[PDB]
Amino acid sequence: AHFPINVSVDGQNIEVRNFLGEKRVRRQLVPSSVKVSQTDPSKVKDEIIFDGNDLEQVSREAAVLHQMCLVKKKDIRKFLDGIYVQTKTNIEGME
RNA sequence: UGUCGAACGGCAAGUGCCCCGAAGCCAUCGCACGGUGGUUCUCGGCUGAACUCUAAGCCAGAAGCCAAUCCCAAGACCAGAUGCCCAC
């Protein structure tokens, strides 16, 4: 709604800065072979798209960023702070 | 005050009383120091079977416990290491 933000991913770790107003980084390790980028530049501006091969070795960490999110002593429904896991989906490709 | 003849000097008042007093001791009266790693459960959640967290496969983490730092130290009887050495 208001908070302009930034996020980051540095090779093997993930950063989360100015989350809800928290001006520090929120790290999280990712295993060897799960490569990911952003589309913050312009067209999407929001999404984090996880790719990979294994059912539960990329689902295991596409579960904690939604655990790294909650706003606790606060009404939750009236406003939606968080870059949270979106739309469990089986994306295939023929492009 | 008393007292050594008087000063000087002391002494007696179970340390006369008093001011100051180093050393030592001591004060939340002074001062220094006391911010660490795993493990798990609440739990957010993952896969889905027979669709959801779990029936098996699983991350994750506050306290918690557990060691660790810390204090003691083999009656835990240390075949730990090491220094030195007899008579008969």
Account of the protein in words:
The chain is an all-beta fold. It is 0% helix and 17% strand. It has strands spanning 6-10, 13-17, 36-38, 48-50. The strands form 2 sheets. A two-stranded antiparallel ribbon has the order 1-2. Strands 3-4 form a two-stranded antiparallel ribbon. Strand 1 (6-10) and strand 2 (13-17) form a beta hairpin. The structure holds one RNA strand of 88 nucleotides.
Short recap of the structure:
The PDB classes it as ribosome. With 95 residues, the protein is mainly β.
Reconstruct the topology from this structure:
Layout: E1 6-10, E2 13-17, E3 36-38, E4 48-50
The structure holds one RNA strand of 88 nucleotides.
GO molecular function, one term: rRNA binding
Family: Belongs to the universal ribosomal protein uL6 family.
Protein name: 60S ribosomal protein L9, putative
